[PDB]
Each structure stands twice: as C-alpha cells, then as structure tokens.
Design a protein around this ligand. Structure first.
Ligand SMILES: [Zn+2]
Ligand SMILES: [Zn+2]
Ligand SMILES: [Zn+2]
Ligand SMILES: [Zn+2]
Ligand SMILES: [Zn+2]
Ligand SMILES: [Zn+2]
Ligand SMILES: [Zn+2]
Ligand SMILES: [Zn+2]
Ligand SMILES: [Zn+2]
Ligand SMILES: [Zn+2]
Ligand SMILES: [Zn+2]
Length: 523
C-alpha cells in the first residue's frame, strides 16, 4: 500500500524493485529496461513495441544503441536498444500520485551515450534516485539512436534523417500515455538534457510532433540554435560513408537503399573524427547530427518558436563550456610552458568567420583581443580562447534562444542561468543529478551545497514552472527572464541576493548579433 508492485502499462504488467531509504518508511521504486518501441531497423523510423504476456521484470539496464567505442576502433550496443528507466519516489504512508515527471535526454555530440551514463565510484551518472527522492518527482531516462545509425541523411525523402530525434519523441509519447499508472501527472512533463541532449530538448519543444505532450523544458549547455546542431550538407557526409563501405554515390536513391542494407557496424565505424592534427576547427567535423527535413524539423529552428509558446523554459550554460573544443583547436591552453600567440588566435578566428572574409576575421580578432594590450599574460590570452569558443558554440546561441522563446511566449515563463564552478569537476551534470550525495566520498561539503540548490530549482520548476516555488527552499530568488531585464541566475557555491545578475557579456552578444551580421558576405 506504500509501494507500487506490478504496474499495468499498455504493453502489459511491469515489475521493478522497491529500495527502502532512510529509517522511517520512505523508499523508491526503480524500473529499468521497459521497451517503448520495437527493435530498430537500420535508418528506418521507430515502430510500436508489441505487448507481452505475464509480468515483465524491469530489473536491469538494457543495451545502448549501436555506437563507436571512444577509441573509435569497435562498436557496442545493439539494434534492440529503445528502452527507458523510471524512478518513482515513495513516502511512508501512501503510494505517490500526480507527481511531476522529468525526462532526461543525454548528450554525447549525437554520436555516443546511453540512459545510464558513465559509471564512477559505483554509481551511474544518470541514476535518477537522488533527484526523484529529494525533489519528489518522477525521473525517466532512455536510449535513442546515435551516430550514422541515428542521423545519416541524404537531405531528401530517400533518407530523411532524424531517426534519433524520432526515438526521443517516441519515449516522450510513451511517458504521456503510461506514466499515470506509475503515479505521474502526464499533463506535467518536463524535459531536461545537456549538451546534445540540451539541444535535443530544444528541438523537441520546437517540433510540431510534440504538440500537447510537453509542459516544460530545461536546456543545459545546448540549444537548437547552436552551430553544431543542424547539418546543412548531409548528402556530403552520406557520400563519405557510402564510399568507405562500398556503396555507389551517383544516384541518391540507389545509394540510400545500399546504405540501408549495409552492416550497421560498418556504417557506424565508416568515419572517425581525427584527434590531431586537424585542418579545420573541431566544429567542422560534427557530421551526423539533426537536419532540417521539412517533417520532424519543418523549418530552420529559429522560425519554430511559436511551437514553444506554452512551454516554460530554462536555458543556461557553463562559464567555461567551450574549453572542450578549445583544447583540441589550440592545445597550448593546457600546456603550461607553451604560448598562445596573436597569430595562433587569428588563424582560429579566421576559420570561424570565413563567410565574412578578411574583414570578419579582423573585427572578431580585434574585439576579443582588446584586453590583450593592458593584460598580455598567457593567462588572459588562454582564457580568451576559451571565452571565444564558449561564446560561439554555447553562450550566443543560448541567449538568442532565450530571446526568441520570450518573444513568442504566451503563457510560458523563461529563465536563464550561468553555472560557475570551481569528466571534469566544472560540469553541471553531476550536481543536477545529486552525485555529491550519492557518492559523497568523492565530493566536499561545498559540492553538496551547490547540488542541493540545483535540485531544488530544477524540481520546483518541474512542479510549478517557478523555480522559486515548490517543495524546496532556494537560496536566491530566480527572476524570470525578459528582454528588458535580461536577467540570469549565477549558480555558485555561495548564493544570495547578488547572485541574480543581468546582461551576460552583452558587448559580445551585440557584436555577434548586430555588428558581425551587418558585414557583407564574401564568396
Ligand atoms: Zn522487446
Ligand atoms: Zn550499459
Ligand atoms: Zn542484435
Ligand atoms: Zn489525480
Ligand atoms: Zn508521434
Ligand atoms: Zn567548416
Ligand atoms: Zn579555412
Ligand atoms: Zn555539461
Ligand atoms: Zn565542461
Ligand atoms: Zn567542487
Ligand atoms: Zn521576482
């Protein structure tokens, strides 16, 4: 009477595990490996999963979708991968009902990842237990297809792409139809995700496929407007794969059907992004990502924000999000005894501004190195390289998305954040998921303070659309974003009234959205 037991879903009964928590009667019901769609076919849209007889034992994580290992030498996962996982918190007197529902979408550059995440200190990163029990919400995680098997496309109807986005949508629709049986409120679904997952969250809110399914959304370090998200030239990348696996490249239809019957492991390993050295910035080699298909993504995402008019929305970034691509594009920023020079940075800037030619390279170099005259230290120069990559890859897209969502808002609220700290220790995911509480030996008291506050804001928002209002106290009043106030919450170790800030790097946002765009395109 205080836990779920066998749950009747549309496919049949499902049995999970009840984990007792604390000493006074709380617990958590955990379901792992519930199928939400059929075994996948290579480069075909997902399909309903047939029902089952008896009681499905949802006791273990299932296989991730077929993908390259990080050494890009081999593969793991399986074509039968579309499974989801659920954490339902339980109090000590009665079974939970009408709980808010948060669906996590993992990142991994659309190339790798799974619903459980990396394992460290005997804990999966996306283990939803700490969010669910501390915020009194239901947490869902799930697998979607990645890499060529998730995103290969010819840019036309022969191979329209976006298979992995359709997988995500199928998981969302399943939760909407079924989660009330677990104690969830299906009218109150919040998506959240990071990096490619944050851009996926954003894409899901913009797609007409999700009309009436999504109540709220959180984009962490990634939005549909980031430059690494939409592949403008998919036929080029599909031809690359066709040549390495021996398919003809003359006719799009013939090539498409050849790829569909190619060993999916050969498809997955067809292309390896070089590690070093590269002729172009890292951004150039993001290949198999979403496309504008005129269907799931009917138009350029910038034109789609009417679809999110009643979806409350949080979006934010990490202060040094770009350090990942910056280290690859300029390895000197990590080597303490190697210099970054004006010539190195010009070269990097010029590669990002090719469409505006020499003038575009100069105006950008000039604005980012303005501070170098008074502070020529390597510390200031290397920080500048990171800030540049953060701005173009994360911050500027995110600010444009916030502005677009606010301008199209009807009932929707809009919120902005900057996460500042001090895998790497600076990253948001581990604090959002409560890792400092689940594996506390690896973390210090200040880490639990930050994670406690992030889970409070996130789960208050899931409950009410107001990060300040819900089951948890918060340290700083988080003011909704408007064009006039342009406010963001700076999330740090010690928060108070001055944590609510405004006008994040506005001179740089204005440069990219006004000055740079006013330059003539060269050819
Ligand atoms: Zn199955
Ligand atoms: Zn696994
Ligand atoms: Zn198999
Ligand atoms: Zn009810
Ligand atoms: Zn649908
Ligand atoms: Zn390029
Ligand atoms: Zn170039
Ligand atoms: Zn992150
Ligand atoms: Zn990071
Ligand atoms: Zn820390
Ligand atoms: Zn207020």
């Amino acid at each position: 009477q205080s836990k779920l037991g066998a749950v009747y879903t549309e496919g049949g009964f499902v049995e999970g595990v009840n984990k007792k928590l604390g000493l006074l009667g709380d617990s958590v019901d955990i379901f792992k490996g519930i199928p939400f769609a059929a075994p996948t076919k290579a480069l075909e849209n997902p399909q309903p999963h047939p029902g089952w007889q008896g009681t499905l034992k949802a006791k273990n994580f299932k296989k991730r979708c077929l993908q390259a290992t990080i050494t890009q030498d081999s593969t793991y996962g399986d074509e039968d991968c579309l499974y989801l996982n659920i954490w339902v918190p339980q109090g000590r007197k009665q079974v939970s009902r009408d709980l808010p529902v948060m669906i996590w979408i993992y990142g991994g550059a659309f190339l790798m990842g799974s619903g459980h995440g990396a394992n460290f200190l005997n804990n999966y990163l996306y283990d939803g237990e700490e969010i669910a029990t501390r915020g009194n919400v239901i947490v869902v995680t799930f697998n979607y297809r990645v890499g060529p098997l998730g995103f290969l496309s010819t840019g036309d109807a022969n191979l329209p792409g976006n298979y992995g986005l359709r997988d995500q949508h199928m998981a969302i629709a399943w939760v909407k139809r079924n989660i009330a049986a677990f104690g969830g409120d299906p009218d109150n679904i919040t998506l959240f995700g990071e990096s490619a997952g944050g851009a996926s969250v954003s894409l899901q809110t913009l797609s007409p496929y999700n009309k009436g399914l999504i109540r709220r959304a959180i984009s962490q370090s990634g939005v549909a407007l980031s430059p690494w998200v939409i592949q403008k030239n998919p036929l080029f990348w599909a031809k690359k794969v066709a040549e390495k696996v021996g398919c003809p490249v003359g006719d799009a239809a013939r090539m498409a059907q050849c790829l569909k019957v190619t060993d999916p492991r050969a498809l997955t390993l067809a292309y390896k992004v070089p590690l070093a050295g590269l002729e172009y910035p890292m951004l150039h080699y993001v290949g198999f990502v979403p496309v504008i298909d005129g269907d799931f993504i009917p138009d350029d995402p910038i034109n789609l924000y009417a679809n999110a008019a009643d979806i409350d929305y949080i979006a934010g970034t990490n202060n040094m999000d770009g350090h990942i691509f910056a280290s690859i594009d300029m390895p000197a920023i990590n080597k303490g005894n190697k210099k970054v020079t004006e010539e190195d940075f010009y070269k990097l800037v010029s590669e990002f501004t090719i469409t505006k030619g020499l003038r575009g390279a100069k105006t950008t170099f000039d604005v980012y190195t303005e501070s170098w005259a008074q502070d020529p230290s390597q510390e200031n120069k290397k920080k500048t390289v990171v800030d540049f990559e953060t701005d173009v890859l994360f911050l500027v897209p995110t600010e444009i998305a916030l502005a677009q969502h606010r301008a199209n808002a009807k009932s929707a609220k809009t919120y902005a954040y900057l996460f500042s700290h001090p895998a790497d220790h600076a990253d948001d995911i581990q604090y959002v998921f409560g890792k400092p509480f689940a594996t506390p030996t690896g973390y210090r008291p200040q880490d639990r303070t930050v994670s406690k506050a992030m889970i409070a804001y996130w789960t208050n928002f899931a409950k009410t659309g107001d990060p300040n209002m819900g089951d948890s106290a918060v340290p700083t009043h988080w003011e909704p974003y408007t064009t006039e106030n342009s406010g963001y919450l700076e999330i740090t170790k010690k928060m108070g009234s001055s944590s609510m800030k405004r006008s994040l790097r506005t001179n740089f946002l204005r440069y990219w959205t006004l000055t740079y765009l006013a330059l003539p395109t060269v050819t």
